[PDB]
Structure 1
Amino acid sequence: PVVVDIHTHMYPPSYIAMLEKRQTIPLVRTFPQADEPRLILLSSELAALDAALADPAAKLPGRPLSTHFASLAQKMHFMDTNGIRVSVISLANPWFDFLAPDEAPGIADAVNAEFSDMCAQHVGRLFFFAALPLSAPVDAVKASIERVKNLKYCRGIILGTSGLGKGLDDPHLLPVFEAVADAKLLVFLHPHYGLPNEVYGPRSEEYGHVLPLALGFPMETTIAVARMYMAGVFDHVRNLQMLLAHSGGTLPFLAGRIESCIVHDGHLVKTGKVPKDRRTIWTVLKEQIYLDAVIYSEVGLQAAIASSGADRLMFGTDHPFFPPIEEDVQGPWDSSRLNAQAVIKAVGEGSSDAAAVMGLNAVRVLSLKAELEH
């Protein structure tokens, strides 16, 4: 059975170029003491950057911009060294969110074209999720969607939680969901914005990136999806299919609570927002939601499997965001092996469920099969 990674990232060199030229987050900066440039993507990193600029003694801000971000050759090496046959690559956060409305469509088109060309270098081993110019008017977004569906190797759209600027329950976003669903493109929902920094308290900088990455990211995903659900997006766009990063963030754990809070909400019940034929979040989890297996534990994974089914879980690695700190960065990756281990521990090595999660679900759902049998 073929192993497929559906959660794996790149920044093309032209995108990195943009980041090096930016004055505010997201940006890339080189420091005299460091031997790699710094990638600075998050609001949480803002303080450490200010300190690093004002003081040469202070710690390096953000994270290392390793060669893995831009190197297709290293992406292929990672895949070989980690037993991965196919990658569905996506542009990383924050995609095109920071671009001015006028420039966005042109840049998105160029970058999506680059990804198609990247995939063409290793026929059958590479596919991609395209990113959209969501800062531009909805009509430009629609035209951008039509273009990417006709790009070789494109198998979906990656997007963040901000939508057009008002989140995913913004009714102006509905025709974007419709256009993507009608094009039969899987929507890969991915965090970036996290939670306002104050929630982590005055000692947050002591804990590294642990709180914003381990908590802020999955919580953002849950809030965005819950907002979509409450707004009736899944009912208004019935053919919409979504892949959720990090096994839905926390959704599989909180689904029962969300359901209880809905049926016990006085305001919602008495204004008719809780009818009897209402499609529950459980139904949506089985019908319109796919979950990645980037969850690192058989505990989380089992919850995800119970929520969506073994045929709706897809292995990912989140390469290259979590490199080994003390081992060879070109050898096997712990962050990848933990997720594979979680699969084996949860459903058994060599089982049909193991084969499904590890690649066959992605092969089926993302129509990679005709390309694999060639």
Structure 2
Amino acid sequence: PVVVDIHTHMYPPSYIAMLEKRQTIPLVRTFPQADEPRLILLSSELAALDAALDPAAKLPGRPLSTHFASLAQKMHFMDTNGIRVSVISLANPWFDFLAPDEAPGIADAVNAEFSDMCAQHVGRLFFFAALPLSAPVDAVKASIERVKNLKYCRGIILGTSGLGKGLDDPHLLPVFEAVADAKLLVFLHPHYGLPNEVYGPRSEEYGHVLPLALGFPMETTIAVARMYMAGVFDHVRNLQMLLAHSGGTLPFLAGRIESCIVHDGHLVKTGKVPKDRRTIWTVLKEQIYLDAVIYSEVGLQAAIASSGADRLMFGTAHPFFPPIEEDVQGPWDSSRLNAQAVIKAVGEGSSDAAAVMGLNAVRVLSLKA
């Protein structure tokens, strides 16, 4: 049985060294009272960083294990968790924070690193590239041309900020067109979350649960809905999009979105809701793929009902949710839960199981050579 993981990240050592030299988010710090460094990515982690410098105050961020930067460690995880092929991607926030002039050069270097990592285990590793979206659109297009010509590259991973004004930014259209024409799957992934005040004044007490469990998928939903409302999928008809975490909440809210559209007085009266309009259901079946990183047959079944079994792809979200604090060199419960969600949704040994667990990814992303 062929298992493929399309949701699995790394930070190359050069990228981590960069983060260690940074003053502002994202950054890496190393505290004396802990072994491995602290990865600090979110604005929700800022106060804990401030607080951690008594040493009895909790360590900020999350630990930067060897599973972030070691390729042997990625392969070990794959071998121990029964994964044949990984389509690896740079973790959030990618190159979003880089200065415009430096961004393309660093992106092309780091993208080439990922290609080289894939060459170490040919057949078992492909990758999503990231883009220098702080740079001019000219440079973004140039970087897109490069990753198209890098071996083992099968798509682009990107966040919700776009050029800095979201994914409904009309300046971003030529970027979507270039990627779509290059036959590169766009993997949309969260990072920026929601403004932290929505979590209220006790959010610190709940650890990372609210920003990660709610903020991330809600961010993804908002970004895709904006793309949809802006007509991006109509503009770029051959654009294909993989959505992280089974679309965030999109499968569950697709109906409410459709109802709110057709019952929007202003939009209907101003010709924004025409008779031949492609519904979000249609887009979900034609231009959107969903990963199966949803941790439940309940969510997964909604995702399957929305996009179809042939458009769902298994993922683990490695290395972000290691087991606490047991054998990290053993199987990961966070990976197992998603495999269990699939099995319970469609039945183990079913062709839908085989499709979701790897064959969809093999087919859609041409995972050969």
TM-score range, shorter chain: over 0.9
Question: d(CA) in 1 for partners of 2:110 and 2:334?
Answer: 27
Q: 4+ residue stretches of structure 1 with deviation over 2 A? A: none
SS in 2 for 1:6: strand
Work out the CA distance in 2 between the residues paired with 1:48 and 1:267. Answer: 45
Measure the CA separation in 2 of the matches of 1:258 and 1:52: 43
| Whole-Å separation in 1 of the counterparts to 2:280 and 2:8 | 27
| Residues 107 and 131, structure 2, Cα contact 8 Å, conserved in 1 | yes
1:143-171 Cα offsets, whole Å, 9 max, x none, are 00000001000000000000000000000
String of CA shifts for 1:270-300, please: whole Å, max 9, x gaps: 1000000000000000000000000000000
1:369 & 1:22 partners in 2: Cα distance?
38
Match of 2:51 in 1: 51
1:369: how far off? 4.3
CA distance in 2, matches of 1:311, 1:275: 29
- The runs of 5 or more residues in structure 1 that have no matched partner are none
Question: Displacement of 1:253 after TM fit?
Answer: 0.1
Cα-to-partner distance string for 1:72-119 (whole Å, 9 max, x where unaligned): 000000000000000000000000011000000000000000000000
Structure 2 partner of 1:33 = 33
Q: SS in structure 2 opposite 1:243? A: strand
Aligned to 1:88: 87
Give how far 1:32 is off.
Answer: 1.2
Preserved CA contact (<8 Å) 2:38 2:59: yes
Specify the SS of the correspondent of 2:126: strand
Task: Report the Cα distance in structure 2 between the residues aligned to 1:343 and 1:103, rounded to whole angstroms.
Answer: 42
- CA–CA distance in 2 between the matches of 1:369 and 1:149? 16
Distance between the aligned counterparts of 1:111 and 1:311, measured in 2? 32
SS, match of residue 191 in structure 1: coil
SS in 2 for 1:46: helix
Does the CA-based 8 Å contact 2:261-2:267 persist in structure 1? yes
Deviation at 1:70, TM superposition (A): 0.3
SS of the aligned residue for 2:162 comes to coil
- C-alpha deviations, 1:16-67, integer Å up to 9, x for none? 01100000110000011111110000010011111112x3221100000001
CA contact (8 A) 2:194 2:219 kept: yes
Q: 2:358 & 2:161 partners in 1: Cα distance?
A: 30
Q: For the Cα contact (< 8 Å) 2:258–2:279, is it kept in 1?
A: yes
Shift of 1:327: 1.6
How far apart, CA to CA, are the structure 2 residues paired with 1:369 and 1:295? 27
Q: Could you list the per-position Cα deviations for residues 123-145 of structure 1 after superposition, in whole angstroms to 9, with x for gaps in the alignment? A: 00000000000000000000000
Give ranges in structure 2 of 5+ residues lacking alignment.
none
Residue 368 of structure 1 deviates from its aligned partner by: 1.2
DSSP-derived class of the 1:50 partner = helix
Q: Is the 8 A contact 2:246 2:300 kept in 1?
A: yes
Aligned to 1:335: 334
Matched residues in 2 for 1:185 and 1:148: separation?
9
Q: Which residue of 2 aligns with 1:79?
A: 78
In the alignment, which residue of structure 2 is the partner of 1:60? 59
**Cα distance in 1 for residues equivalent to 2:3 and 2:241:** 21
Whole-angstrom CA distance in 2 between matches of 1:201 and 1:227: 26
User: Following the alignment from structure 1 to structure 2, what is the Cα–Cα distance between the partners of residues 49 and 24?
Assistant: 11
Q: 2:18 & 2:268 partners in 1: Cα distance?
A: 49
Map 1:1-374 → 2, pairs under 5 A: 1-53=1-53, 55-369=54-368
1:180-220 residue CA offsets vs partner (Å, 9 max, x unmatched): 00000000000000000000011101101000000000000
Q: Distance in 2 between matches of 1:151 and 1:192?
A: 26
Q: Is 2:123–2:368's contact at 8 Å kept on the other side of the alignment?
A: no
Q: Is the 8 A contact 2:19 2:26 kept in 1?
A: yes
Q: Secondary structure at the match of 2:163?
A: coil
CA distance in structure 2 between the partners assigned to 1:322 and 1:361 by the alignment: 24
Q: Secondary structure at the match of 1:369?
A: coil
TM-score, scaled relative to structure 2:
0.99
Q: Deviations over 1:301-353 (max 9, x none)?
A: 00000000000000000000000003200000000000000000000000000
Deviations 1:247-274 (A, max 9, x none): 0000000000000000000110010000
Q: Percent identity?
A: 100
**Distance in structure 2 (CA, Å) of the matches to 1:300 and 1:327:** 27
RMSD, aligned CA? 0.6
Q: Distance in 2 between matches of 1:292 and 1:82?
A: 18
State the distance in 2 between where 1:195 and 1:11 align: 24
Q: Matched residue pairs, number?
A: 369
1:257 partner SS: helix
2:52 alignment partner, SS class? helix
